[PDB]
């Protein structure tokens, strides 16, 4: 009879995971360092 299923196989992995990745936390510290050396130069 015309009745058959199917199964899928996934080609899914791309740009790193959502912001649970370390990109944002990494970005955080640079601004603090900028503040520090701005102080020193002034």
């Amino acid at each position: 009879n015309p009745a058959i299923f199917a199964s899928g196989i996934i080609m899914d992995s791309s740009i790193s995971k959502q912001a649970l990745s370390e990109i944002e936390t990494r970005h955080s510290e640079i601004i603090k360092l900028e503040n520090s050396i701005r102080e020193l130069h002034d």
């Binding site: 740009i15 790193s16 990745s21 370390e22 990109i23 990494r26």
Partner: peptide
């Protein structure tokens, strides 16, 4: 000293930043 930033996504952007820090 081997680097300054984690290579979460490699890419050219991660090089110069590190270089700058160095």
């Amino acid at each position: 000293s081997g680097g300054f930033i984690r290579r979460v996504t490699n890419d050219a952007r991660e090089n110069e930043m590190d270089e700058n820090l160095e």
